[PDB]
Design an enzyme around this catalytic site. Structure first.
Site, PDB file in Angstrom:
ATOM      1  N   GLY A   1      60.233 -42.646  85.791  1.00  0.00           N
ATOM      2  CA  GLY A   1      60.925 -43.370  84.739  1.00  0.00           C
ATOM      3  C   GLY A   1      62.334 -42.808  84.578  1.00  0.00           C
ATOM      4  O   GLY A   1      62.645 -41.745  85.111  1.00  0.00           O
TER       5      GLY A   1
ATOM      6  N   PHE B   1      65.027 -40.660  82.964  1.00  0.00           N
ATOM      7  CA  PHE B   1      65.020 -39.415  82.199  1.00  0.00           C
ATOM      8  C   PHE B   1      63.842 -38.493  82.556  1.00  0.00           C
ATOM      9  O   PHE B   1      64.039 -37.283  82.438  1.00  0.00           O
ATOM     10  CB  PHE B   1      65.068 -39.696  80.692  1.00  0.00           C
ATOM     11  N   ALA B   2      62.677 -39.033  83.016  1.00  0.00           N
ATOM     12  CA  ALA B   2      61.415 -38.291  83.142  1.00  0.00           C
ATOM     13  C   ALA B   2      60.605 -38.586  84.423  1.00  0.00           C
ATOM     14  O   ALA B   2      60.445 -39.718  84.847  1.00  0.00           O
ATOM     15  CB  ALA B   2      60.560 -38.577  81.925  1.00  0.00           C
TER      16      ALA B   2
ATOM     17  N   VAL C   1      56.502 -37.499  85.820  1.00  0.00           N
ATOM     18  CA  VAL C   1      55.247 -36.817  85.535  1.00  0.00           C
ATOM     19  C   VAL C   1      54.527 -36.426  86.833  1.00  0.00           C
ATOM     20  O   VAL C   1      54.255 -37.269  87.695  1.00  0.00           O
ATOM     21  CB  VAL C   1      54.325 -37.603  84.581  1.00  0.00           C
TER      22      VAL C   1
ATOM     23  N   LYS D   1      55.455 -33.223  82.556  1.00  0.00           N
ATOM     24  CA  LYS D   1      56.551 -34.146  82.323  1.00  0.00           C
ATOM     25  C   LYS D   1      57.832 -33.355  82.497  1.00  0.00           C
ATOM     26  O   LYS D   1      58.029 -32.316  81.839  1.00  0.00           O
ATOM     27  CB  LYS D   1      56.396 -34.774  80.935  1.00  0.00           C
TER      28      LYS D   1
ATOM     29  N   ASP E   1      53.827 -47.675  70.749  1.00  0.00           N
ATOM     30  CA  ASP E   1      53.576 -48.297  72.041  1.00  0.00           C
ATOM     31  C   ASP E   1      52.091 -48.228  72.394  1.00  0.00           C
ATOM     32  O   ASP E   1      51.723 -47.843  73.498  1.00  0.00           O
ATOM     33  CB  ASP E   1      54.492 -47.711  73.112  1.00  0.00           C
TER      34      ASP E   1
HETATM   35  C1  LIG Z   1      58.681 -41.721  81.206  1.00  0.00           C
HETATM   36  C2  LIG Z   1      57.940 -41.783  82.489  1.00  0.00           C
HETATM   37  C3  LIG Z   1      56.482 -42.067  82.606  1.00  0.00           C
HETATM   38  O1  LIG Z   1      56.000 -42.577  83.631  1.00  0.00           O
HETATM   39  N1  LIG Z   1      55.730 -41.711  81.531  1.00  0.00           N
HETATM   40  C4  LIG Z   1      54.486 -41.023  81.495  1.00  0.00           C
HETATM   41  C5  LIG Z   1      54.170 -40.283  80.356  1.00  0.00           C
HETATM   42  C6  LIG Z   1      52.988 -39.564  80.293  1.00  0.00           C
HETATM   43  C7  LIG Z   1      52.067 -39.555  81.349  1.00  0.00           C
HETATM   44  C8  LIG Z   1      50.823 -38.723  81.286  1.00  0.00           C
HETATM   45  C9  LIG Z   1      50.761 -37.669  80.345  1.00  0.00           C
HETATM   46  C10 LIG Z   1      49.664 -36.831  80.241  1.00  0.00           C
HETATM   47  C11 LIG Z   1      48.594 -37.030  81.116  1.00  0.00           C
HETATM   48  N2  LIG Z   1      47.404 -36.395  81.239  1.00  0.00           N
HETATM   49  N3  LIG Z   1      46.647 -36.946  82.228  1.00  0.00           N
HETATM   50  C12 LIG Z   1      47.373 -37.927  82.740  1.00  0.00           C
HETATM   51  C13 LIG Z   1      48.622 -38.057  82.069  1.00  0.00           C
HETATM   52  C14 LIG Z   1      49.746 -38.897  82.162  1.00  0.00           C
HETATM   53  C15 LIG Z   1      52.410 -40.283  82.492  1.00  0.00           C
HETATM   54  C16 LIG Z   1      53.596 -40.998  82.573  1.00  0.00           C
END
Ligand code: A1H9M
Length: 320
Positions: A20, A22-23, A25, A40, A132
């Site tokens: 995404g 800025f970020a 994961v 992240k 969201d």
């Molecule tokens: C901003 C970019 C993006 O793709 N966002 C995002 C945020 C959080 C997750 C996430 C967070 C924690 C987690 N634990 N098991 C799986 C996840 C996914 C993914 C993508």
């Protein structure tokens, strides 16, 4: 970039699972415990002017300790990056589950939905909103328990409230109730209440607030949907009429416990012992260091061991 030097003393990086603006994961392994986490990675240069906002949201997330919220373990800032280490949820998304099952029964919807309501009620009680909510933002842990992810920092119009999409100001809490109503409908129907092939037409449908009600929905289901899916936010059920809602209580006979079953600070003795051993500290010294709660490597190791415990697994740090 040398931005990864510190991080790689504590984590082994695996595959990217999300990108995404800025970020990014990434999946990763915390070396001392061998536990999988999600990291992240945020670039400070990209954030630029918004960097203060993210720091604020990071602090909000430090106070969101709850059994149905994906937990923050570690914040590591370098010259160019902020890394946030988070609880790994291995069961995949609610989204995937709904499709595999086609639609959920009222009974199973209720199991899942009470967990969502718990998370979201807790967020609202802390003076925050999610803004969201959608099945992609709800992941299952090892035990098919839901964890809410992705508060801010990052980021589907199908789940957005009418006042949000009209760009007017909106109360996060009220928009969350709408989104949760859409979620309820999707869980029990296996399709969206409002859909279209272009934004303008979808927006109109959402603002009109009319949807079909399939024949298999109970009267009580239909009634809770009508209380949540009110185009006028003021007319929407409050989160607190929802914890107590008849539909929510059927077959449980007790309200959703939304309060965190999480110790204010009360440290876990087994976790402290293991750290004391590892660091060659007496118990009191170790407890004093943990109690600083700096969201450094110590906070992370502590929280991971505590999750090892809460999941009946051994409270041990790998060391050879
Ligand atoms: C901003 C970019 C993006 O793709 N966002 C995002 C945020 C959080 C997750 C996430 C967070 C924690 C987690 N634990 N098991 C799986 C996840 C996914 C993914 C993508």
């Amino acid at each position: 970039m040398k931005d990864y030097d510190e991080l790689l003393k504590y984590y082994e990086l695996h595959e990217t699972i999300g990108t995404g603006g800025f970020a990014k994961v990434k999946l990763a392994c915390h070396i001392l415990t061998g536990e999988m986490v999600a990291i992240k990675i945020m670039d400070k240069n990209t954030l630029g002017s918004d960097l203060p906002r993210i720091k604020t949201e990071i602090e909000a997330l430090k106070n969101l300790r709850h059994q149905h919220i994906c937990q923050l373990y570690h914040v590591l800032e370098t010259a160019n990056k902020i890394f946030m280490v988070l609880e790994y949820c291995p069961g995949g998304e609610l989204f995937d589950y709904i499709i595999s099952q086609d639609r959920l029964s009222e009974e199973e919807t209720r199991v899942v939905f009470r967990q969502i309501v718990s998370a979201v009620a807790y967020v609202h009680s802390q003076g925050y909103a999610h803004r969201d909510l959608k099945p992609e933002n709800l992941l299952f842990d090892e035990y098919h328990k839901l964890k809410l992810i992705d508060f801010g920092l990052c980021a589907s119009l199908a789940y957005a409230a009418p006042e949000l999409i009209q760009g007017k100001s909106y109360l996060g809490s009220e928009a969350d109730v709408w989104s949760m109503g859409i979620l309820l409908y999707v869980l029990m129907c296996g399709f969206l209440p409002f859909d279209d092939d272009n934004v303008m037409a979808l927006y109109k449908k959402i603002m009109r607030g009319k949807y079909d009600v399939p024949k298999w929905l109970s009267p009580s289901s239909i009634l809770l949907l009508q209380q949540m899916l009110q185009v006028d936010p003021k007319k929407r059920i409050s989160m607190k009429n929802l914890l107590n809602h008849p539909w929510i209580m059927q077959d449980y006979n007790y309200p959703v416990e939304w309060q965190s079953k999480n110790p204010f600070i009360h440290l876990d003795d087994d976790c402290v012992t293991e750290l004391s051993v590892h660091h060659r500290n007496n118990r009191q010294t170790m407890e004093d260091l943990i109690s600083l709660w700096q969201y450094d490597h110590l906070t992370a190791t502590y929280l991971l061991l505590l999750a090892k415990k809460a999941r009946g697994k051994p409270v041990r740090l790998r060391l050879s």
